């Protein structure tokens, strides 16, 4: 029920795909960066505990990326966190949510045990992280380059006006003809590309 809101609000959840699983009940789903990670973490204990939790369960996340979309390289730093969100029952029957809470508390131990993966799995995730970092610095560079390109365009127009103003009549005529001829030459060179 909560896949939409999880994907939209959670930046880190948006870095993963969403696949079903035959082990899980048809109202649950797994979000991961690697099927190997899904195999290593989707334990029968967790599956049974989530089944016991039922519809009160909202989501359970193991992450190193922030909740909100970062905008700087200093922002995009790993920070290991385990998150468990769930709705509160009206009848206060918390025994069903006890398996989730217990397994959540023991999550760091299980993760220290089994969350070590071969370099191929690590290379799969760090590629995505590098792509995100590159996307951030990309937009930084586009903003800076756009500002300096506006400055350079203004300087070009100023130079054209300043030098074209004081030429002779025939000098201005020849200059305009040269501009037109060069523009046409470059347009034809672009048009002649195969």
């Amino acid at each position: 029920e909560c896949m939409k809101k999880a994907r939209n609000d959670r930046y880190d959840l948006s870095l993963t795909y969403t696949k079903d699983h035959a082990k899980l009940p048809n109202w649950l789903a797994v979000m991961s960066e690697s099927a190997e990670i899904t195999d290593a973490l989707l334990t029968p204990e967790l599956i049974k505990a989530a089944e016991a939790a039922g519809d009160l369960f909202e989501y359970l996340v193991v992450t190193d990326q922030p909740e909100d979309k970062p905008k700087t390289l200093n922002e995009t730093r790993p920070r290991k966190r385990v998150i468990l969100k769930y709705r509160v029952p009206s009848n206060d029957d918390y025994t069903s949510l006890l398996p989730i809470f217990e397994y959540f508390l023991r999550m760091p131990d299980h993760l220290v045990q089994v969350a070590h993966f071969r370099p191929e799995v690590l290379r799969k995730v760090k590629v995505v992280r590098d792509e995100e970092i590159r996307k951030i610095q990309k937009a930084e560079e586009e903003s800076k380059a756009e500002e300096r390109a506006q400055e350079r365009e203004k300087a070009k127009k100023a130079k054209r006006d300043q030098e074209l103003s004081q030429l002779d009549a025939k000098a201005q005529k020849k200059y305009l003809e040269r501009e037109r001829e060069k523009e046409l030459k470059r347009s034809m060179k672009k048009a002649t590309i195969r």
């Binding site: 800076k144 380059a145 300096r148 350079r152």
Partner: protein, 170 residues
Amino acid sequence: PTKSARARGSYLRVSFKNTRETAQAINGWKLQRALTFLQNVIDKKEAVPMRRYAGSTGRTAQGKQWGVSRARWPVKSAQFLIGLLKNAEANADAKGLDTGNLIIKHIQVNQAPKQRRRTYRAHGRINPYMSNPCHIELILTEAEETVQDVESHLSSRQRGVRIRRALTAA
């Protein structure tokens, strides 16, 4: 990586040997100094020292400042290098680098595929008449260039000597 601009040209019909000598002459220099020196070479006011490809070349007084006797004025090579340096300047300006502090950090001249012509010899013979074009590649970088374990496996006798000496001294 981000404080550098680069330029290159390929299959340039200019003498590879002369271009290599000129590039070696301007290697490691400031950009403005290199441009001025190349224009001076074109004007025959400064000379490029001929060091590797200098067999049976001439001697000049302008080679004194390089410590050599054989120096020349490869005008065509100087013009090609001026064009490439200007392209690198334009790239640095577009990137936003401070063009007044650029240094020729990398410069390399390689041999390009040779172009074929014929020459005619005595007794009805034909000999090759080849040109030796070059690829040129250069990288300018902003200049900062301001640069400003313990004994672990001693023996027991060495450690005892150290301890005794330390106790005796203080």
